[PDB]
Amino acid sequence: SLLNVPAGKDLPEDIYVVIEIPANADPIKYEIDKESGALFVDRFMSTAMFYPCNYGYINHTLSLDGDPVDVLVPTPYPLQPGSVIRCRPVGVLKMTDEAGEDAKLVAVPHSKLSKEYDHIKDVNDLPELLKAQIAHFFEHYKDLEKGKWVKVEGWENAEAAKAEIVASFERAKNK
Amino acid sequence: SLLNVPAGKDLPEDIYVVIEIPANADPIKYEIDKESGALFVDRFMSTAMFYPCNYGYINHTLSLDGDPVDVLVPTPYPLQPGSVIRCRPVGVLKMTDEAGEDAKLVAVPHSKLSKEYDHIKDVNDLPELLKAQIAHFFEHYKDLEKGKWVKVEGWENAEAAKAEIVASFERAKNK
Amino acid sequence: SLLNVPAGKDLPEDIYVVIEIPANADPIKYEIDKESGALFVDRFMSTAMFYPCNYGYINHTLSLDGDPVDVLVPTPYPLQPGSVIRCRPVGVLKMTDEAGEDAKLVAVPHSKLSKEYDHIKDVNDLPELLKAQIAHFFEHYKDLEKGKWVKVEGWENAEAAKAEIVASFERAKNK
C-alpha cells in the first residue's frame, strides 16, 4: 500500500515523496488517509488558485504539528495523485498560521529521474518566479476560509530542510 | 486498501463513497475488484454518453442484488477514480432492468468539504436538469447492449435513501 | 471576423460577449487584437490563479479606460477562446485600480442557450461563493506585478450593469 513506502533510499539526501495533489490541477484538496492508504477528498478549495508544484509528504515522518513532513516538488509535467517520486531536498518555506508555525519543504526530482534539476543545489538556485508563486499561494489559498490565515516568514537552505527531515524521521519512531 | 474504507463516520447521515467513475469521463466503465481492491476495466461503453455525476459505492454494504450500494455524487470538478468522498444522502432513483429492480442513491458532498450543497436537503432540492439527465442516462446508456433494458420508476426522498443504506449495511454483516 | 460581431441582439438586455479567456484555464492572458481580430497572447499571469468564469468583452463599446466593456460569463463548461456567447447582464463588480474606478460586469447565458440560469435575474441571485471568488481573484491576480493593484468596492445591480453597457455603447458611436 502507500503506507509501506519508505521515507527514502538514503535520508535526508535521497527521499521518496508521496504525491497527494498534482501541480496545476482542479481545486480539489486530496489527502492520503493514514488508516487506509486511500486517496480521500479533504475539501474543495474555495479560492480560484492551483498548487504551483506537486504537493505530497514523506512517509514515516512526524512533524511537531502531528502530521508527516509535507513537500512541494516541481516536475516538468504534473504527476498522478498517489504516485511516489524520488527527490532531493533543496530548501524550506517557513510560515505561521492560525494553528502555529508551519514549514513546507521543497525538493526536486532525483538525478536518476531527470538531469534537468542537477544545477539546483539549494533554495536560492530555484527560479525566483517559482519561489514568489509558492509564497503567494500559501499566503492566499485559504483567504475565503473563515478563521484561517497564513503569513510567510521566509526561506531556509537545504541544510535546514535536511535537518527537518532527520528530526521528523526520528520523532516518528519515538512519539 | 480501498477495501478497508469505512461505510461512513455516522451512517446513514454521514457516509464515505468510493469513486469508480468520474463525472464527464471517457466511456470507460471501471469497477473496484472486491478481491484485490484494484481498479478493473469492467467494459468500454458502447453508447456516446458519459456519467452526469461521479459514480461509486458505499463500502461494507450489500444490496439484494448482491453488490454494494451504488451512489451518484455531483461535485464541482470530476473526482479521481479510486478516491473516497465524504457525503450526505439526499434521495434515490428507483429503476427496473432485465435482472430485476434496481436503485441508485444520490448523495452530495459533506459540509466539511464544501458549503455549496448545504441548501440541498432532499431529492427535490436537486436541480431539475440534473435529475432529468441522470434519469435519461440510465434509461439509455445500455441501449446498444443486446438483451439489456432499463425503465426508470421514479425518485424517493432522503429518508428512503437512508433506509436503504441502513438495511444494506446490516445485510452486509448477516448474509 | 470577430470585429464584425454585434454588441447584442437587443441592448442592454440581450448582448453578445466575445470570449478571450475560458474559465479554469492555464494562466495565459489572451486578448483579441482590435486591428486584426486575431487572438494575441497579452501575457503569462504570474500568480497561480485562474479565471473563475469565462472572460471577455462586448464589441462596439468603449468604456472610460479606453477599452470595450469587459464581462465574466459563468457556463457549465469552459468555452473556446474567440467564441461568442449570447448573454443577459445581471450585475457589476466595482473596483479601484491604479488608473481609477473600474467595473467588470457579470452576464449569464441567454435562456435560448440554456435554462439553468433562468432564475438568476440580479446580483443577489448569483451564488455567494462565486461572487467571493470573483472578488478575490481580481484583488490578487496582479499581486506579483510591478505597479499593479486592485481594491474591490462592491457589487451593483442589473440596472447598474445595463447602464454601463448603454453608456459605453453610446460613447462608442462617437467619442
Place this chain on the structure above:
Amino acid sequence: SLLNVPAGKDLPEDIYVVIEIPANADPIKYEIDKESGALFVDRFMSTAMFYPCNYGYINHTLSLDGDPVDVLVPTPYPLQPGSVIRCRPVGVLKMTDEAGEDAKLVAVPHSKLSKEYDHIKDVNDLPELLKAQIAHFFEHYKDLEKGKWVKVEGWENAEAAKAEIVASFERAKNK
C-alpha cells in the same frame, strides 16, 4: 475567414468540411455564424451525450432545410472547432425529425492527410459500432428538448452522399 473556404477541391469526391464540434467534447453546441464567420455558442446540450465524430458542414452548399450540408468526420484525434479538413464522402444517415426528412453525411479524411481510412470506400466499410453510435446519438441527443425529436430511417451509400453534395452545391449557386 471561414466564409471564404471552398466546398472542396473536386466536388463531390474531394471536399472540405468546416468543423464546428469536435468528437468526444463537452456538450457545447457551437455553430459558425454565417454573417461574421465567428464561432457562436448555439446551445448547451441537455443530455449527457457527446458527438461520436467531429461535426461540421460543407461551405457554399444549401440543403433543403436552409442550412449547409452537415457532415460527421471520424479522425484518430479530435479536431479544433473552426478547423477545416479535406475529406472524401462515404455515406449518409437518413432521418425524419419534426421538420421532415434529414440527412447527415459521413466523410473520412482524404488519403493525403492519412492512410488509415483508405480501405473505407462506402457505408458498408465503416465499423458497425460507429454507425450504431451515430444513429443512437441522433435519435436521443434532443430527448430533453421541448418539441424536438428524431427518428432514424437508415444508411445510404457513397453515391447517395455525393448526390446530396451536388444538389446542395448547385442549389446554393442560385436558389
Place this chain on the structure above:
Amino acid sequence: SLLNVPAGKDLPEDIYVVIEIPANADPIKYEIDKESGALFVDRFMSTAMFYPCNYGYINHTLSLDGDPVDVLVPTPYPLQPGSVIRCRPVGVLKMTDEAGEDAKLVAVPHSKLSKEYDHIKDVNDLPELLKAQIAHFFEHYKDLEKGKWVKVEGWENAEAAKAEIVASFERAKNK
C-alpha cells in the same frame, strides 16, 4: 493491492494486464514498485515521444531479464495508470538492446469488455500503421539516453506470445 492481481482467468488465452503507462500520456515513465504495489515515477522521458498504446505487465510472471512480462494494449481511450484490463494475446515484438534481447507482447481487450477487437486473432490482423508506430517508438524513445540502444528484430504470432506467457508464468513459481 495491485500485487494480489491474478495473471489471468485462463492463461495464456485470457489474461489480466496491470497498466503502468496510458497511451498518449505526458512523457512520464511510471512503474508499479514490486515491494509496495504503489505507482513510482521511474523517470521523465527525454525524447518528445509518447507510448502508442497503454503499457503494463502480467502479474505473477518472470522473464529471463528478471522482470514480469510486459504488454502493450491498444484501447479506444487511454486507461488509468494502476488499472487492470482483461486481454487476449495476439503477438510479440522481438528486440535487442544494450542489456540483451527483449520482447514485448501485444494484447487486445477481451470480448467481454468490447467486441471491437474480435476480428484481431493474430499479429498480422493489427493495423499496419500501429505496428510501425510501436516498432518506431521502441527504436527511438531511448535515443537521448547515453549508452542505450534498441534494434527491432521482428514480430511473432499469437502462439509465440502464449508460449512466452506460459513459460514466464511457470518460471515465476520456480526461480
Place this chain on the structure above:
Amino acid sequence: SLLNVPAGKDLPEDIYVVIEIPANADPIKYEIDKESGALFVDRFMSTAMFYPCNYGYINHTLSLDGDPVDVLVPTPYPLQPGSVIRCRPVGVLKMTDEAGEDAKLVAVPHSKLSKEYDHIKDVNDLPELLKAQIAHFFEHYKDLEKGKWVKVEGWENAEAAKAEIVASFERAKNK
C-alpha cells in the same frame, strides 16, 4: 484575420509568431491556409511524437522553400492554434532535408509577456535538453513517411536567426 498580422513590432529583434501547432499536442499537423487565413489540417503525423515547443511562422516573410519563416516558441503552457505571440529570436536549427538546406528558428516570449526568458539571449542560453529534443524531433518525425527525411547540421546564433528573418522579410516585399 491572421493574414493581416505584422511580421513584428521591430524586425528582426521584436517579432510576432502565428502559432499553428501547440507544444505537447496530439499529432495533428495544422497549417494556416494562406488564401483564407483558416486553420487547415495538413496531416495526421504517423510517428508517436509531439512538438517540444509551440510551432508557427512569421507573417509576411518568404524563405527560399516558398513558405514563411517557421519558428519554435517555448512557453510555460501550450498556446492555442491560431494565436499570435510576441517573441525575440535567439537561435536557428540548420538541417538538410530532401529539398535541401532548411532552418527552423527558435524565439522566446518577449519580456513584456513574461520575465522567465530574460536571461536567454542566444542559442547557448537555451537548456541543452530542449535543444536535443528539438533536433531529435526533426530528425525522426517523418520516419514513417515515404520519400521524407531530415538530417541536422547544427545550431546557429541570434545574429544568424535575425539574418534569416531580414532576408526572408525583404524577399517577401518583391520576389
